[PDB]
Write a protein that binds this ligand. Structure first.
Ligand SMILES: *[C@@H]1O[C@H](CO)[C@@H](O[C@@H]2O[C@H](CO)[C@@H](O)[C@H](O)[C@H]2NC(C)=O)[C@H](O)[C@H]1NC(C)=O
Ligand SMILES: *[C@@H]1O[C@H](CO)[C@@H](O[C@@H]2O[C@H](CO)[C@@H](O)[C@H](O)[C@H]2NC(C)=O)[C@H](O)[C@H]1NC(C)=O
Ligand SMILES: *[C@@H]1O[C@H](CO)[C@@H](O)[C@H](O)[C@H]1NC(C)=O
Ligand SMILES: *[C@@H]1O[C@H](CO)[C@@H](O)[C@H](O)[C@H]1NC(C)=O
Ligand SMILES: *[C@@H]1O[C@H](CO)[C@@H](O)[C@H](O)[C@H]1NC(C)=O
Ligand SMILES: *[C@@H]1O[C@H](CO)[C@@H](O)[C@H](O)[C@H]1NC(C)=O
Ligand SMILES: *[C@@H]1O[C@H](CO)[C@@H](O)[C@H](O)[C@H]1NC(C)=O
Ligand SMILES: *[C@@H]1O[C@H](CO)[C@@H](O)[C@H](O)[C@H]1NC(C)=O
Ligand SMILES: *[C@@H]1O[C@H](CO)[C@@H](O)[C@H](O)[C@H]1NC(C)=O
Lengths: 254, 50, 120, 361, 50, 49
């Protein structure tokens, strides 16, 4: 089942500065009171990150290239964003990786789904409306884990596709800032590696509608792009990354 | 593969030992100067300027 | 600990012997350097208990008996301001021994001028 | 000393002759628990098996398979592997496993083999010439057979063309034995291709039903989720051992540590990028790795013209790990420590010197 | 082929750097001697013979 | 300008860093040598006219 949305209001996409966010642990190696320099796919310091709005009327669910990596940030309240769609052609021709989070748990599947032109969920003022797919023919991998989930919760996510492994880094940060990304440092701990071994070149975010026609929940998220560069990471005595330096930002950091 | 590793590590060790020898020659020159200063400034009064 | 790697390394002959010999030469040269700089007197001199040197005050350079290391205040400050088959060999002279050399040199030059450097 | 110096006369001094190494006592292999087992109980010993012309294809992936348990069962009268070794199944890793289960006649069991041509090989199940995996077959005369005759199993007897490898054909199109045209209507030379099996208890060996499970292995670029079991042994601490933690191996002394790893971290490294701490996969406790106490072995000797007595210095080695005298330079063996003070004859290090008067320190 | 060229050129560069370090040590000794001559002959009158 | 060669050279470790550091040390040592030989007075003296 698919439903067209013909009550949107036209608005060009926005941009904002990444500030000092997007740093994650490159590997599972502990380090104490050591300054470590590594070369890995990182989100550059002070770079423009594409800004999407969802406010009553805006509903932004486009299809974007994966490229070499994606940094996803979400100032999330009332849990509007529920999952992500991963694949190349977004139809039955190829195979897709599905990441969803419904009312019970998170389901991670690798199947050849049929995707709607407008995939979304539905909330009735209880969740009783699922219209994101119409068929599921050939499955090859299914995985179940525990759920990951004014603005009161900020979610950061980094997705990578190297050697067929899908690495998910995350960090739950409580903030109280109204509109834009806050200023600070927060390293994204790895959550789970998915040995999927499939081709991914595109992605799409999954939202949820409100019924009372449809009403757009108030939300805003960001999508960045990973660029391979060198970082100088600081590890404190407790072993967590407290500050970082981009070696190719400006001559002082170099 | 082990032969490649052995050549690399032996080259690294030789590089270390060579630069250690050069630094040791510099430190020996400095220590000879320090012994001369000990003899001529501490154990006597020197008329040598500076 | 690889036996195969050591068997392959045996093909290269005496390279390890050369490296160890050079490092041993450096190590003995360091001790020789310290001997030439500091072991210039065969007599361990002591200052008199009364520090009456005509108004001249050597407290900052004479050893401090209160400290456990028997180092002068300036020497104490100097020591405070300087901070896989690999071994570090300790020096032949300890820091206490080098400080005792410096104390002997200071006592000799304070109590006997340059005379102790040329004889009794 | 004479052999190191390549001389039969040794001058007075101290000479490094060899290197002391604390040889490891045990080998420790630590691996995470064997969890999320493969569902082999619902394949080999399920409720009902399928017919050969419509063989079910069971996919085994994202789990650990203990092929030794399946191998050591005595009820399996046939265990033939054509691309792998039966004893190496618990060590190798593959992307996914295809399991085909069906019922065939006793004499048709050997037709499931590469290079073998027969009714079942051509029209019911086809294997490639470069097939890999194991074919497991056992008799099922106590479960499939019935006194009234188990005719529920049908097998394809004729087809115009042979099956391609791993091809399923559930079609019931009428076979044309002769050249007479048939539009799906049976005639004198047009018969149904499926014939009911004659499994009976009165049938002897050869006509008894067999349940055959065929294992196939794939070696594509996808991650090899299917891996054999890991035999993690017990942990030994405070000793020089060869550790093996999740494939990272080395020699060292495993000791308790006060370092608090973040929960996602497994290994620890120092400023020089050497592994000095590891989290144990079985019990989540951080273990500190200290290298086994190696050192240089130096021989203190006067000239051979004077005496043949020697003293041995184990550089940077505690005396409990090798006239036993502990110095800051290391453990000194064979020299008696005296409270007197003399001028240095043979330098040991850290203010200690050795001389011959016996050899004193 | 690049590995052959890399090891050859790295060996050449290491040899050059070693010669430059030894020559720099010699020139540093000469410059220390020249500074001593400046202090003891230009800035003063020296009793040292020759 | 070969990027493949540089990627292969990265596998050899910090040899290039060591050589660059040694050459930089020699370069600063030359200036130190000239400084020690010639800058022995902080005052610029001039002869009378
Ligand atoms: C929602 O809208 C999209 C486009 O606005 C629809 O996609 C098109 O559907 C027509 C229907 O015949 C096709 O002819 C076009 O080829 C489709 N376009 C693309 C790019 O695929 C979509 O079908 C609509 N959803 C529903 C349920 O009608
Ligand atoms: C020599 O110098 C030392 C320190 O320069 C003098 O020690 C000081 O003595 C005064 C009073 O006599 C104290 O108030 C200071 O705190 C002392 N300073 C230190 C660092 O101890 C010492 O009196 C001087 N004279 C003699 C004869 O020793
Ligand atoms: C990011 O992109 C926007 C528009 O695409 C542009 O205005 C902005 O200057 C860019 N950021 C930087 C740092 O150049
Ligand atoms: C959430 O999705 C899973 C996946 O199919 C499903 O089994 C479960 O019933 C869903 N939860 C609810 C509340 O419907
Ligand atoms: C994928 O599904 C289509 C239709 O559902 C089917 O024709 C095809 O054989 C399937 N491929 C595999 C590899 O299962
Ligand atoms: C992945 O898909 C893209 C286009 O969707 C294609 O250009 C690329 O070659 C594919 N990669 C692989 C390894 O098949
Ligand atoms: C390290 O953690 C301890 C408790 O786990 C805490 O008391 C201390 O302040 C922390 N130090 C730093 C630098 O984060
Ligand atoms: C039936 O086969 C399964 C395969 O895993 C095995 O675990 C089970 O023990 C078998 N049943 C009997 C009675 O041996
Ligand atoms: C593994 O088994 C050990 C054995 O007692 C147990 O303590 C541990 O909780 C188990 N699970 C994990 C994840 O280590």
């Amino acid at each position: 089942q698919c439903v067209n949305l013909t009550t949107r209001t036209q608005l060009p996409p926005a941009y904002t500065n990444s500030f000092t966010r997007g740093v994650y642990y490159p590997d599972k190696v502990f380090r104490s009171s050591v300054l470590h320099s590594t070369q890995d796919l990182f989100l550059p310091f002070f770079s423009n990150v594409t800004w999407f709005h969802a406010i009553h009327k805006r509903f932004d669910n486009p299809v974007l290239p994966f490229n070499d990596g994606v940094y996803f940030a979400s100032t999330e309240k009332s849990n509007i964003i529920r999952g992500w769609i991963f694949g190349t052609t977004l139809d039955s021709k190829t195979q897709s990786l599905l990441i969803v989070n419904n009312a019970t748990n998170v389901v991670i599947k690798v199947c050849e789904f049929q995707f709607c032109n407008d995939p979304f969920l539905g909330v009735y003022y209880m969740e009783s409306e699922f219209r994101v797919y119409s068929s599921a023919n050939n499955c090859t991998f299914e995985y179940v884990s525990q759920p990951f989930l004014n603005f009161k919760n900020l979610r950061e996510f980094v997705f990578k596709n190297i050697d067929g492994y899908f690495k998910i880094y995350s960090k739950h940060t409580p903030i109280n800032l109204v509109r834009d990304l806050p200023q600070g440092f927060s390293a994204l701990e790895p959550l789970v590696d998915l040995p999927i071994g499939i081709n991914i070149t595109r992605f799409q975010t999954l939202l949820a509608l409100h019924r009372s026609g449809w009403t757009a929940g108030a939300a805003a998220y960001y999508v960045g792009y990973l660029q391979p560069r060198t970082f100088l990471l600081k590890y404190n005595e407790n072993g967590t990354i407290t500050d970082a330096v981009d070696c190719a930002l400006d001559p002082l950091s170099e | 593969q082990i032969d490649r590793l052995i050549t690399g590590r032996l080259q690294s060790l030789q590089t270390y030992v060579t630069q250690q020898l050069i630094r040791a020659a510099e430190i020996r020159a400095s220590a000879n100067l320090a012994a001369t200063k000990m003899s001529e400034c501490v154990l006597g009064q020197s008329k040598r300027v500076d | 600990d690889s036996t195969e790697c050591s068997n392959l390394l045996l093909q290269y002959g005496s390279f390890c012997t050369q490296l160890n010999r050079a490092l041993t030469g450096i190590a003995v040269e360091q001790d020789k350097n310290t001997q030439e700089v500091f072991a210039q007197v065969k007599q361990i001199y002591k200052t008199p208990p009364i520090k009456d040197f005509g108004g001249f005050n050597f407290s900052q350079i004479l050893p401090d008996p209160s400290k456990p290391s028997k180092r002068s205040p300036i020497e104490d400050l100097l020591f405070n301001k300087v901070t896989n088959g690999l071994t570090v060999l300790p020096p032949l002279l300890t820091d206490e021994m080098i400080a005792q050399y410096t104390s002997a040199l200071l006592a000799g030059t304070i109590t006997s001028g340059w005379t102790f450097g040329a004889g009794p | 000393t004479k052999c190191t110096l390549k001389s039969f006369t040794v001058e007075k001094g101290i000479y490094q002759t060899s290197n002391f190494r604390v040889q490891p006592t045990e080998s420790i292999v630590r691996f995470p628990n064997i969890t999320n087992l493969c569902p082999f109980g619902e394949v080999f010993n399920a409720t009902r098996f399928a017919s050969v012309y419509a063989w079910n294809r069971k996919r085994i992936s994202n789990c650990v398979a203990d092929y030794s348990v399946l191998y050591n069962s005595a009820s399996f009268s046939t265990f033939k592997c054509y691309g792998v070794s039966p004893t190496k199944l618990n060590d190798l890793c593959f992307t996914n496993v295809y399991a085909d289960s069906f019922v065939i006649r006793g004499d048709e069991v050997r037709q499931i083999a590469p290079g073998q041509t027969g009714k079942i090989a051509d029209y019911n199940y086809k294997l490639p010439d470069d097939f890999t995996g194991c074919v497991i077959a056992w008799n099922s005369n106590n479960l499939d057979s019935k006194v009234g005759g188990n005719y529920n199993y049908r097998y394809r007897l004729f087809r115009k063309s042979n099956l391609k490898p791993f091809e399923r054909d559930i079609s019931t199109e009428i076979y044309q034995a002769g050249s007479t045209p048939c539009n799906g209507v049976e005639g004198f030379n047009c018969y149904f291709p499926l014939q009911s099996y004659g499994f009976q208890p009165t049938n002897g060996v050869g006509y008894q039903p067999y349940r055959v499970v065929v294992l196939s292995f794939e070696l594509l670029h996808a991650p090899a989720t299917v891996c054999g079991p890991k035999k993690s042994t017990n942990l030994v601490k405070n000793k020089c051992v060869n550790f093996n933690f999740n494939g990272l191996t080395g020699t060292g002394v495993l000791t308790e540590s006060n370092k608090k790893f973040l929960p996602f971290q497994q290994f620890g490294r120092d400023i020089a990028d050497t592994t000095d701490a590891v989290r144990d996969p079985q019990t989540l406790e951080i273990l500190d790795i200290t290298p086994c106490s190696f050192g240089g072995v130096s021989v203190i000797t006067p000239g051979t013209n004077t005496s043949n007595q020697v003293a041995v210095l184990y550089q940077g080695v505690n005396c409990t790990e090798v006239n036993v005298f502990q110095t800051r330079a290391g453990c000194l063996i064979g020299a008696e420590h005296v409270n007197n003070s003399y001028e240095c004859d043979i330098p040991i290090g850290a203010g200690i010197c050795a001389s011959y008067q016996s050899i004193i320190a």
